[PDB]
């Protein structure tokens, strides 16, 4: 959470999205004090260095930066957005909401797979990438 | 008009607002009696720092 870089106004978010030409921008929209946001923060920080080559991590507090809440439906406790060359990328996670990752994922390997699949799909010019692992079921048994 | 509606809602929510907030405060104090805040458990070491 506190380790990852933080963006304070919407213009900084725009500059961060624009300035990345060959890396996928992963932005966590939420509140640093939210436990689900805390899980996203800890997972991202765990894999913030492994995927440095083909990704970058930014943290945005939607209370101090509400400028996207209307347009990006930033109302879930924690959402994850992927961008490539100033273009939001959708992921067919299987949950019915391809626009964002609105839930907390425990496994960092799953998030690394998601980021790599997003990079592969968006590099090829595609706008929607099929997630390697289905998420229509939590597989709890 | 939004201010008037909000004042209306606050006035109506004030039926037991003070009672239940006092109850919540008492329950919070009872819970913290045996389980202090995390920064409280480190306050002494923090001062020694």
């Amino acid at each position: 959470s506190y380790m990852l870089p933080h963006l304070h106004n919407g213009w900084q978010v725009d500059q961060a999205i624009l300035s990345e030409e060959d890396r996928v921008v992963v932005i966590r929209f939420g509140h640093d004090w939210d436990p689900t946001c805390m899980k996203m923060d800890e997972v991202l920080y765990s894999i913030a260095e492994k995927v440095k080559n083909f990704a970058v991590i930014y943290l945005v507090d939607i209370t101090e930066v509400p400028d996207f809440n209307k347009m990006y439906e930033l109302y879930d406790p924690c959402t994850v957005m992927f961008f490539f060359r100033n273009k939001h990328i959708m992921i067919d996670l299987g949950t019915g909401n391809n626009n964002k990752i609105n839930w907390a994922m425990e496994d960092k390997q799953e998030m690394v797979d998601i980021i790599e699949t997003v990079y592969r799909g968006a590099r090829k010019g595609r706008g929607l990438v099929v997630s390697p692992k289905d998420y229509s079921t939590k597989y709890r048994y | 008009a939004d201010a008037i509606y909000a004042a209306l809602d606050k006035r109506m929510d004030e039926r037991r607002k003070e009672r239940r907030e006092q109850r919540e405060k008492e329950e919070i104090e009872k819970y913290r009696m045996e389980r202090p805040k995390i920064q409280q458990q480190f306050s002494d070491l923090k001062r020694k720092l």
Binding site: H31, K52 | I28, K37
Partner: protein, 107 residues
């Protein structure tokens, strides 16, 4: 003393002799590898924020998470214990309206 380098054939003193050998056969591709190592080291980008940002982020979290910090225990996300920003809805039809609202937002 004076010794002849077996790889160079020059009269060199014995005091530096062993050292003269060590940096005598040094492979220039080692210099190349060191150069590429320092270039890739300078090619890194700060993945994590500096100390000021981390300290400020912890202060902000503490101001909100009173169940972990502070003295007064409020709810999970409350700090205690005019102008409202207008945001685009992502519709091209309202682009002009948002633009003129931002223009009116000027000082």
């Amino acid at each position: 003393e004076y010794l002849v380098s077996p790889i160079t054939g020059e009269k060199i003193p014995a005091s530096k002799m062993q050292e003269h050998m060590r940096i005598g056969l040094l492979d220039p591709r080692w210099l190349e590898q060191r150069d590429r190592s320092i270039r890739e080291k300078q090619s890194d980008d700060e993945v994590y924020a500096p100390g000021l940002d981390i300290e400020s982020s912890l202060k902000q979290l503490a101001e909100r998470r009173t169940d972990i910090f502070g003295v007064e225990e409020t709810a999970i996300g409350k700090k205690i214990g005019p102008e409202e920003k207008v945001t685009w809805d992502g519709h091209s039809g309202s682009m002009a309206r948002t633009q003129q609202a931002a223009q009116a937002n000027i000082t």
